[PDB]
Structure formats: structure tokens, C-alpha cells
Design a protein around this nucleic acid. Structure first.
Ligand SMILES: [Ca+2]
Ligand SMILES: [Ca+2]
Ligand SMILES: [Ca+2]
Length: 676
DNA sequence: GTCTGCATTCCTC
DNA sequence: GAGGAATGCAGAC
């Protein structure tokens, strides 16, 4: 037998890896259960002709945030031991268990989000940091999803990433010798017959089968060079699709990307560099100090890097002296030593970022801007980072005492301090009338950070955490309603730190799905789980569940708000629909009505038998929930004790159905004890 | 209170 | 209208 571990943000992320494996592997025998209270498992027996294989995948939902807050040891430390100095966390880490320790096989990130401008590089930090470790990095992104107007939930123009984003993964792969790739899965809203923007998209770009093949080959310890080349070719084909759809006068053409790809030129020595300039777009509301003046100086000497409006460009060594002179004149820089450092004879990449929102809170997308530059032109390139967003007084005080202290606590400052050779600030200060100008020669500091690795030591995560939280409530709820209770369906599942999944409803042999679910609802709140049961009542049951660590965490009227959220989505035509036999997704045509279903709400939480009959009555009064699911762990022997408390006779019929049908041929129901 | 994970919306060319 | 810039949220530290 071979044992693998799937460390994920939550149970849903872990299960997505299993679903990829299961899509290509047709197992003979499948067993599910728990190895510990927090860790579910899937044990499969499959064959490749005459060759049988026995694998077990132990899932570890919830990564550590500090060092030993959830698990006894952090699996992410194995990445920091190999050079991953950014605390960017992937969605999943797959490990192999050999000689009493774990060994990373790959890191996976799932992104459904709209690739709208800077959202495309928001998570480039994890690709950069994990990519420089030698462990493979796979970025799976849904192509395509539409943006909605929210006023009436109608569709707006499709959003595509800049061609340089998919390309950065290919260039980081070449520079490091590692496998870092962007893979595209067919989204439900990919409807080329209806949208002219997709007329020239090659459907061979989709990588569902190749991602499954790659994972299985890695698990089997086989040569993945061929699969890697197929995946790199699809990433290159996406660069072709995107670059051939943009105006060539301000963006790189496919011929330019191809010449960099085949090794004819490097991105900074392209013979055509300069045909377009770097022209950073700054909103009027973001302007302050001498920022507009600095931007004019950059546009006087810059050459465009990939796109004229990307937040970075190049100042060639031939123009560096004049650019530095102009910056010195603008900001009154007169120190001879500083000027000599700035005038080094090499090409300089200038990156201009706001960095901070009006309240001083850091911009999440900006954390990936320097990693994007480093992935395209190599981390060794000289980077001049200009910041103009508002700083909290505490941040500017740390900049003047120890910039590394600020980088230690904040991820945006960590991105800036790790990859910038020069850090220039022209920032407003919260509580002050005018801007602060700073020029930090960060060259030696950057060099030291690029060679930093944490203590070398083996890691084997103990399957029992420090304590059981909301993620464990979600794992238990997911296991019960998705694997144990029959004729069930998981339309919605949003555990702590989860993706924007969407809601699926099955009715009359069709599956209807709402995508791009907004968090803001006038009368409702998005449920953490929506379970559909069709063989209990004449009308299908939709059970909306909100999970918390404690019963007191259930907000007032949460039960009513969950129902109102479902009613809110029913007021709009589903985004997509498909037949259960056909399987081909189409745009939604017919509307769904709430009275065609029985809507119930439930609150799930951990309680160590501290709730009396009157306490349950008070929770029902506060929340308005139709059902309360009190969960408690028993340590000796390990078991999850479940107590179902119904408010009304409809919920009581559901409870009796769960009790009678708490039996499975796949899931080990022996790990649970249902009190009632 | 702030982390950093998750996003959709705003604004300039 | 194209496409980056700019904005906020949440559970557990
Ligand atoms: Ca995540
Ligand atoms: Ca994700
Ligand atoms: Ca929740």
C-alpha cells in the first residue's frame, strides 16, 4: 500500500483533488472513513490491466496560520526549507508518506474568480515562492465566468487575463527548471456559440484530462516530462489566444512571445522593445505629492514590458543615468553615495503600485505584482518599486527603524522587501497633511532574502489538532450529507477560507446552477452548505446549513436569513442548466420558484453536552433555525457524537430519515454515534 | 485589531 | 467598451 496526504484549506479543497484522480481512475473497491476526528480518508483499490494498486489518501483540512495553532507541525514549512520565503498559501499540498516522513509531490491552487486586471496576478506570489522550491506548482483556473451587474443580475463583458500572466508561469518554469503551469478547465459559462469574444478559442487548451494524468503519474512516480510538455503547450496556446486578441501597437504580439519562448531573445533584449512605452494608469483619487510628476518622468524614458498599461516597465541602461537625474531633481536627492547606487550600469525594471487602500490596509492584488515581474524576467533583475498609497503612522515609523520588522508581519511589505532592489515611497500618512518621501537602497537586503531557507527537518503532521473548530464542523457535515445519507446533493459548500462555489439545484432531471454569488443580500446570508434531499417529501428539500464553532456564535435570525438568501437567488434566472443524461451546460432559460421546494434552515456547532432543553429553545428563538446539529468529539475511542434537535414536525421527519438511513457501503459509519 | 485567504467593482486609456 | 486599478470581507489567530 502507498499512503498520500492531501493538506487543504478545507474539506472541499481536499475532495477536489480526489475528484480529479477519480475522473481517470476507475476503482474496483472504494472505502471511506476517518483516520482521526479531523482527518477523513479515501482508500482505493484499482488496476492498470493486470497490475493492482492500493492507495490511501488522508485529508488534513485547514492549514496553520502561525506555527502550531491548528496542527502540531506546519506542512508549509517544507516549502520554506526549499526557498519559499513568501507566506502565500496554495489551496492544496499533496505529499507522499515514506520512511516515517512526508515528501511534497505538488502544490495546487484552484481559481474560479474573474481574471479582471490585477486579480490575475493577485495569487502570483504563491506561484513565484513555491515555484523556486523545486516542488511543482499547478494553477487551475475556470475559463470562463461572466461578471454580473448586481442591480438585476444580468451579464457584463467577459474578463480575460493579460497575456503576460499565463506566460509568467512558462518563463518561471524555464528560469527555475521546475514545473509551474496554468491549466484551464471548461467553465459552465463557456458558451462559444453565443459570445463573439470566444470565436477564436481553441478547445484543445482545456486541461481536465491532462491534469488528472499528471497527478496520477506523479503518485505512481513515473516520468511526467511528456505530460508536462502537453500542459506547457496548452499554457502557451492560451498566451497565443490572448495576445492575438489584443491591439498589437500597445501589447506584445504572439511572434514576440514565441521568440522569447523558443530562446531566441530574453524579455529585456527583444529587438522590438520600445515600440510602445510604459504608461502606468493612476486613478485621480489616488494622486498625491509628486506622484503625477514621477509618472511623467517614467513615461519620458520607459519602454513597455509586455503591455503599455501593465504596472511595470523598463528603463534601459542607456537611459538610466538621465532617468535617475530627473528623479533626483524631483525629490531633492543630493547624497553622492545614494546616486552612485541608483546609477548602476544595468537595465532597471520600474514597478508603480498604490499598495494601500484609503484606510492603510494593503491591496491584496499588489502582493503578486513583484512576483509577476520576477517570474517574467528572473528574480535577479534590478527592480525599482514606487509606492504611492496611504500609510498608517505605525508603518512609516517601522520603515524608519527596521523595514524587516514590517515585512515580517505584513505580506505586502514582505513582497516589496524580498524583490525590490530600490523602494521609493511618495505616500500620504494617515492623520497628516502631506506626503513622506523615502528612498530605500534594498539591494543587499534583497540578495540575503533570496538565499533564505528555514531549518532542515522532517515533518509528519499528527492527525489530531490542537482543538476542533468550524472547519471540523464543516468536515463532519460534508461527510454525513455527501457520503452517508442517501439521495443527497451538495449544491453549496462554503467552509472557512473557501472559494465562491455557486448553488446547484436538481429538478425534473435537470441541474440548474447560479454562479458569481454576491455576499451582499438585502435580507439574506449565504449558507455554508445547501443539501438537497429528493426522496423524503413530494417536493424536494433544500436544507441550508450555517456552521459555527459554538452555539452562541449563531447570529440572531441566521435561520431566517439563510432561507431569504435562497429566495433571493430564486428571484433570478439560474446562470446555467444541463440535462443529467446529456451533460452539456447551456445558459439558463427557465426561472425557479421557492414554493416548488421545502426550505429548511439548520445550525451546526460543537457542544460538549452543555445545552439543556431550555437552552435549545432559546437558540431556536434567537436564530429561527428549523434544526440544530450539536456535534461533539469522543477521544476514547475516537468517535463523532451527533445530536439532532428539530424545531418542528417537518424537521423531525428529516431527523428520522437520517437516523434510519445512517448506513453506507462506502463510508465507515462506525466512526459516528447518532444520539438522536 | 490585523492577518491573509476570498472576491467583485471602480476608473483610465 | 477594453482592461488595469481600486475597493472590501471573514474566522482565527
Ligand atoms: Ca485557499
Ligand atoms: Ca482558490
Ligand atoms: Ca461558515
Amino acid at each position: 500500500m502507498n499512503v498520500f496526504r492531501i493538506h487543504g484549506d478545507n474539506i472541499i479543497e481536499c475532495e477536489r483533488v480526489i475528484d480529479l484522480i477519480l475522473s481517470k481512475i476507475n476503482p474496483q473497491k472504494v472505502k471511506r472513513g476517518f483516520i482521526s476526528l479531523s482527518c477523513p480518508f479515501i482508500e482505493i483499490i484499482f488496476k492498470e490491466g493486470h497490475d493492482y494498486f492500493h492507495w490511501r489518501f488522508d485529508m488534513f483540512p485547514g492549514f496553520n496560520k502561525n506555527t502550531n495553532d491548528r496542527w502540531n507541525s506546519n506542512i508549509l514549512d517544507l516549502l520554506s526549507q526549499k526557498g519559499s520565503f513568501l507566506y502565500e498559501t496554495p489551496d492544496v499540498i499533496i505529499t507522499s508518506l515514506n520512511n516515517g516522513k512526508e515528501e511534497i509531490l505538488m502544490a495546487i491552487e484552484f481559481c474560479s474568480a474573474l481574471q479582471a486586471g490585477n486579480q490575475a496576478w493577485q495569487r502570483s506570489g504563491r506561484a513565484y515562492s513555491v515555484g523556486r522550491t523545486g516542488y511543482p506548482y499547478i494553477y487551475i483556473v475556470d475559463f470562463v465566468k461572466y461578471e454580473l451587474n448586481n442591480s438585476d443580475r444580468s451579464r457584463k463583458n467577459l474578463r480575460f487575463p493579460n497575456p503576460a500572466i499565463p506566460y509568467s508561469y512558462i518563463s518561471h518554469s524555464k528560469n527555475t527548471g521546475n514545473f509551474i503551469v496554468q491549466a484551464y478547465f471548461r467553465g459552465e459559462e463557456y458558451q462559444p456559440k453565443y459570445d463573439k469574444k470566444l470565436k477564436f478559442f481553441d478547445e484543445t487548451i482545456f486541461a481536465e484530462d491532462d491534469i488528472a494524468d499528471y497527478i496520477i503519474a506523479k503518485l505512481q512516480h513515473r516520468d511526467t516530462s511528456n505530460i508536462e510538455q502537453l500542459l506547457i503547450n496548452k499554457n502557451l496556446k492560451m498566451v497565443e489566444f490572448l495576445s492575438k486578441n489584443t491591439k498589437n501597437d500597445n501589447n506584445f504580439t504572439y511572434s514576440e512571445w514565441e521568440s522569447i519562448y523558443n530562446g531566441t531573445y530574453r524579455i529585456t533584449n527583444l529587438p522590438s522593445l520600445g515600440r510602445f512605452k510604459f504608461r502606468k494608469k493612476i486613478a485621480e483619487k489616488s494622486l498625491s505629492g509628486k506622484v503625477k510628476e514621477f509618472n511623467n518622468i517614467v513615461q519620458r524614458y520607459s519602454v513597455g514590458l509586455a503591455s503599455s498599461d501593465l504596472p511595470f516597465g523598463v528603463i534601459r541602461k542607456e537611459s538610466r543615468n538621465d532617468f535617475i537625474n530627473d528623479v533626483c531633481k524631483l525629490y531633492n536627492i543630493n547624497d553622492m553615495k545614494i546616486i552612485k547606487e541608483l546609477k548602476e550600469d544595468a537595465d532597471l525594471i520600474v514597478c508603480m503600485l498604490k499598495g494601500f487602500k484609503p484606510r492603510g490596509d494593503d491591496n491584496r492584488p499588489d502582493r503578486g505584482a513583484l512576483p509577476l515581474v520576477a517570474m517574467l524576467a528572473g528574480e535577479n533583475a534590478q527592480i525599482f518599486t514606487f509606492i504611492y498609497g496611504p500609510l498608517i503612522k505605525g508603518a512609516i515609523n517601522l520603515i524608519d527603524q527596521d523595514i524587516n520588522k514590517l515585512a515580517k508581519r505584513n505580506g505586502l511589505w514582505k513582497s516589496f522587501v524580498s524583490l525590490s532592489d530600490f523602494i521609493v515611497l511618495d505616500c500620504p500618512i494617515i492623520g497628516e497633511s502631506y506626503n513622506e518621501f523615502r528612498l530605500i537602497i534594498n539591494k543587499n537586503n534583497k540578495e540575503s532574502i533570496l538565499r533564505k531557507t528555514s531549518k532542515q527537518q522532517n515533518i509528519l503532521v499528527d492527525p489530531t489538532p490542537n482543538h476542533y473548530q468550524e472547519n471540523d464542523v464543516d468536515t463532519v457535515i460534508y461527510s454525513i450529507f455527501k457520503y452517508i445519507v442517501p439521495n443527497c446533493f451538495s449544491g453549496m459548500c462554503n467552509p472557512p477560507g473557501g472559494d465562491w462555489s455557486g448553488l446547484s439545484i436538481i429538478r425534473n432531471g435537470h441541474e440548474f446552477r447560479w454562479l458569481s454569488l454576491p455576499r451582499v443580500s438585502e435580507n439574506g446570508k449565504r449558507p455554508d452548505h445547501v443539501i438537497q434531499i429528493l426522496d423524503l417529501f413530494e417536493k424536494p428539500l433544500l436544507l441550508s446549513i450555517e456552521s459555527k464553532e459554538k452555539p452562541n456564535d449563531l447570529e440572531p435570525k441566521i435561520g431566517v436569513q439563510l432561507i431569504k438568501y435562497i429566495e433571493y437567488l430564486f428571484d433570478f434566472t439560474p446562470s446555467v442548466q444541463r440535462k443529467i443524461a446529456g451533460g452539456n451546460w447551456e445558459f439558463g432559460n427557465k426561472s425557479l420558484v421557492p414554493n416548488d421546494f421545502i426550505l429548511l434552515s439548520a445550525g451546526a456547532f460543537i457542544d460538549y453536552d452543555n445545552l439543556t432543553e431550555n437552552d435549545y429553545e432559546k437558540i431556536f428563538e434567537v436564530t429561527g433555525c428549523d434544526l440544530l446539529i450539536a456535534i461533539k468529539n469522543q477521544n476514547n475511542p475516537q468517535k463523532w457524537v451527533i445530536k439532532f434537535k428539530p424545531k418542528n414536525t417537518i424537521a423531525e421527519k428529516l431527523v428520522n430519515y437520517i437516523k434510519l438511513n445512517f448506513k453506507s457501503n462506502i463510508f465507515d459509519t462506525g466512526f459516528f454515534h447518532i444520539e438522536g
